[PDB]
Design a binder for this molecule. Structure first.
Ligand SMILES: [Zn+2]
Lengths: 61, 136, 111, 58, 155
RNA sequence: CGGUCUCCUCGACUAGACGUCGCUUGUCCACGGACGAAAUGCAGCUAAGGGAAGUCGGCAAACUGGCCGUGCACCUUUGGAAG
RNA sequence: GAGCAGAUCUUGGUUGUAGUAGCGAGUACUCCACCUGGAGAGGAGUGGCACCCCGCUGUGUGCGGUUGAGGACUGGAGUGGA
RNA sequence: AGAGUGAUCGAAGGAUGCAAAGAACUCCGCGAAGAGGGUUAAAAGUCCCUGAAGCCGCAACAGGAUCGGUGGUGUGCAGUGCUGUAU
RNA sequence: ACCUGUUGUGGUGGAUGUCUUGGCCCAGGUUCUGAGGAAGGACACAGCAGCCUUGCGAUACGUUCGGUGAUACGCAGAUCU
């Protein structure tokens, strides 16, 4: 488990799920030093954690 | 009883690549090297001079470019395999045995697929100007 | 000294349809990656072959059992670019979107 | 069927802890300890088992 | 204690290493060391590198019933050979410790050869495997003790 | 790979809580790798001409298959048979 | 309570079998990066070199975990939430 | 301890040394180990009085087709002891 | 190389020998539990304690007092001549 706690906290704080959370691969260190929901909030505010837009089930067809 | 499997009972094992002698094969033609003749596979009926190598070459072999033999039927082994040809030993006196053979036609169409044409010029004349030919 | 051991850059077309032919559908793309490795090894005479993630993406653009029939690759046999150890060449094989493989023979960069 | 596949339906509890003998022998439905017989004042003990006595003697 | 089954003429010309409860299959380590027995230290290490790289193999002479035939076993007039990876790595560590011991004793290890490499069956550690019809059978690990002596060349 | 109580339950095709695929959620974990990968096997398929000649025995597989329109026999306990 | 070769004898420890049979239901993995004592892989690989450096040579389709980029599965009577 | 829903069933398991003096320090290794070096009368090394048979590894030596066997017999040949031994 | 053997050695193994705070046996004495709460069962209680204890009960591995008379101890920590 490298970033599992951070992914879970980010899923909670973003109201999506860990499979829509994007952790910056070029900031893995600062992400791994998160340790709390407050620091995950800071990371989300800073852009190292993102809520990926829901995939498309287009209805034009 | 006998309480042993015998040599006469069919068992599984190596199939093929055995030494075999296929006897009484008639030679239907001896053609000269294609480098010197360029028309070795032409017969009484053909109007275009052609060599026994078919269209697209012999599959997995290539061009035939040496003195070739036309053995009747099938000979052992795959292509590219070395076949000793000996003078017959189990000699008969049928006409099937002592018969003169003259070849009237040699099928040189493509054996890689289904070849409708015996000659690349025949193929041209049938399928005339195409895009690649008109681009050349 | 050998040119085998010098930095190089080739652009070459691997035909992956010779590789993934008769192969098990669920394993075609894994076999194509392994074949790209073996290809680049035979060519660049290295042991460190590093496939670009975009080249992986391209090889998998059809999923398994849908591997493209050929990929234009760029084999860059590179100096180790940073070490404290010995020379240790390595080759980063990337993908070249070509849209047309016509008369596209092997090329060398800055010949 | 009998074995492996009917061992899965085997939740529930015939017996639970008795408050006299602290043994999981107190039948829940008929509130009777299967070892000491709790509801009645005498302790349950038969001469046909010396070991059972040994395990509770003073 | 510390007792090897090899008497050297001058232990001032030797290098010794021992391994206990090595948690490697014995029957593969035995064949590994039997192949490595008489080789020099350089030949030995190169042989192990090549066995790891699968370029040449380890002949399974005694403990090899069912082993697959190889073209790489012609090196030893045999046909059954394999590439025991964990045992090759463990014997690599063994010989590396023996070479370090040589260096400590003040000895060129590249001049020494392998004299008396050896393996023993250690104490077996049990596990449970679960068989049909409600049976239980053991899984015993069969580990090994290893020992090696390197003796300097005599010219 | 068995069993074990209840609740919520999206989009498209569709009669649909069938079946097939997809957003949300979750997951890539089941010991793996090479070699086109023998024989045999367990599974999926095909097969000319014939069509049960196979076999205790049409076993196994195959044929048919949804819906709409026309229409439907013997026998009947008048209900059916009947898709 | 006094002698073992047996009693499908009792208890314990073992052997061959045998590195064998196997570890084949639930479709599936791949690439880069980081985490390592090591994991793009060597035991003093080899020639100069007298360790630095410059050459040459070998490396098993390659442990584990986690981001990211792809490929797929679950497909609401779920591998989801109680 | 463990097993059984339960009534009940129910094991295996003793010994360092006089004294913990229970292994300092060194090299190598990630580390365990290992190689040294120590304690001690001795490693007797927390598996610790001794350590049998069966089985296994290794080295040396002797042989190796044949129920043409194990075993017996009478010699032989190698290796290996023992006893006696005149002037 | 493999096999068979014989030695030497090293492992696996725990037989043997020697002992024993244990049992078994015989003889003698006592039998002395409880509604003033027994026998048993729980949950607690130690600076570092899980188990065990015919240890103990919120006064909780112990309180008063007597006999003894410098320890106890696996570490520490203040009391003690
Ligand atoms: Zn009770």
């Amino acid at each position: 488990a490298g970033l599992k706690l951070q992914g879970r906290l980010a899923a909670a704080l973003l109201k999506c799920g860990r499979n829509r959370v994007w952790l910056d691969p070029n900031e893995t260190s600062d992400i791994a030093m998160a340790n709390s929901r407050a620091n995950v909030r800071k990371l989300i505010k800073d852009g190292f954690i993102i809520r990926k837009p829901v995939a498309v089930q287009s209805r034009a067809r | 009883h006998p309480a042993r499997v015998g040599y006469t009972v069919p068992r599984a094992g190596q199939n093929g690549f055995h030494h075999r002698v296929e006897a009484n094969k008639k030679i239907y033609k001896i053609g000269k090297s294609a480098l010197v003749d360029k028309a070795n596979a032409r017969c009484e009926t053909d109007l275009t001079d052609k060599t026994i190598t078919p269209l697209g070459g012999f599959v997995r072999y290539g061009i035939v470019r040496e003195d070739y033999l036309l053995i009747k039927g099938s000979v052992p082994g795959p292509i590219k395999r070395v076949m000793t040809i000996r003078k017959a030993l189990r000699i008969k006196t049928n006409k099937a045995f002592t018969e003169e053979v003259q070849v009237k036609f040699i099928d040189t169409s493509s054996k890689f697929g289904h070849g409708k044409f015996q000659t690349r010029e025949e193929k041209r004349k049938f399928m005339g100007p195409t895009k690649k030919s008109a681009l050349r | 000294k050998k040119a085998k051991n010098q930095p190089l850059s080739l652009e070459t077309t691997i035909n992956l349809h010779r590789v993934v032919f008769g192969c098990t559908f669920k394993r075609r793309a894994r076999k194509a990656i392994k074949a790209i490795r073996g290809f680049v090894r035979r060519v660049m005479k290295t042991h460190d072959v590093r496939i670009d993630p975009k080249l992986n993406k391209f090889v998998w653009s059809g999923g398994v059992k849908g591997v493209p029939f050929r990929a234009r690759l760029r084999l860059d046999r590179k100096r180790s670019e940073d070490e404290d150890s010995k020379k240790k060449l390595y080759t980063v094989v990337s993908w070249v979107p070509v849209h047309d493989f016509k008369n596209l023979t092997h090329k060398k960069i800055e010949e | 069927t009998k074995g492996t596949t009917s061992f899965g339906k085997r939740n529930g509890r015939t017996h639970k802890l008795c408050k006299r003998c602290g043994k999981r022998s107190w039948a829940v439905q008929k509130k009777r300890c299967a070892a000491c017989g709790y509801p009645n004042p005498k302790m349950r003990s038969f001469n046909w088992s010396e070991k059972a006595k040994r395990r509770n003697t003073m | 204690k510390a007792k090897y089954s090899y008497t050297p003429k001058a232990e001032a010309k030797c290098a010794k290493a021992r391994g206990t409860d090595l948690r490697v299959h014995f029957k593969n380590t035995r064949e590994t060391v039997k192949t490595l027995h008489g080789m020099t230290v350089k030949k030995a290490f190169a042989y192990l590198r090549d066995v790891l790289a699968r370029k040449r193999c380890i002949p399974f002479r005694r403990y090899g019933t069912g082993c697959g035939r190889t073209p790489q076993a012609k090196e030893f007039k045999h046909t059954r050979g394999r590439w025991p990876v964990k045992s090759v790595e463990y014997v690599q560590n063994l010989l590396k410790n023996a070479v370090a011991n040589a260096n400590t004793k003040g000895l060129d290890p590249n001049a020494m050869f392998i004299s008396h490499i050896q393996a023993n069956r250690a104490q077996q550690q049990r596990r449970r495997t679960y068989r049909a019809h409600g049976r239980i059978n053991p899984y015993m690990s069969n580990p090994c003790h290893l020992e090696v002596v390197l003796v300097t060349k005599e010219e």
